[PDB]
Design a protein around this ligand. Structure first.
Ligand code: FES
Ligand code: FES
Ligand SMILES: [Mg+2]
Ligand SMILES: [Mg+2]
Lengths: 109, 109
């Protein structure tokens, strides 16, 4: 999958080729490619990795992808929701698939 | 350049690899890859090819890209305007460069 990372904190977007099937996350791939957001956490509760995801190409994975915790974090920042509109996720919880994506970090802590 | 075409009239987006430097347009590349919008014109006045363009990667070409005619067509549909926000263009007037793009047709005649 090809992922384009964007952030108010990045002067340029970063285009990354990611191998699906190795249990990678959007945040892990970003850091692995030198896209190191300033704040993160180990329990998926901080919300700092919030991203707006735009579908570019490939199959979307039809399935319940949000744990109760991620849903509660998204609700607490006002972002709880075959056409594919932009969707909000915690990047540290978002599993990389074969889908090509535009991934926009919000930049707030 | 990689271009992702999207339209309310397309069930799936279409990812295209385009060679820059051969005086290609977004509409020409789309048709060349089987993305044939239903309506078009030869004088760039019909407005049917209106697209919303999102920057994905690569250098943006800094230069006056809009003729008076395209500006007037864009104004007539309410779409006249190193950070790169989404911009509206006539796809038949938009020259392909090395920039990777998401290109969304509006779908209206
Ligand atoms: S890095 Fe803390 S919620 Fe994702
Ligand atoms: S195809 Fe008519 S203005 Fe572009
Ligand atoms: Mg940026
Ligand atoms: Mg579509």
């Amino acid at each position: 999958a090809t992922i384009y990372f964007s952030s108010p904190l990045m002067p340029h977007n970063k285009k990354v080729q990611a191998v699906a099937g190795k249990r990678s996350t959007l945040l892990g791939v970003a850091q692995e490619n030198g896209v190191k957001i300033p704040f993160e956490c180990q329990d998926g509760n901080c919300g700092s990795c919030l991203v707006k995801i735009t579908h570019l190409d490939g199959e979307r994975i039809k399935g319940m992808l949000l744990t109760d915790k991620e849903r509660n974090v998204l609700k607490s920042v006002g972002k709880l929701p075959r056409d594919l509109p932009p969707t909000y996720r915690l990047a540290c919880q978002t599993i990389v698939t074969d889908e090509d994506l535009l991934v926009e970090f919000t930049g707030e802590p």
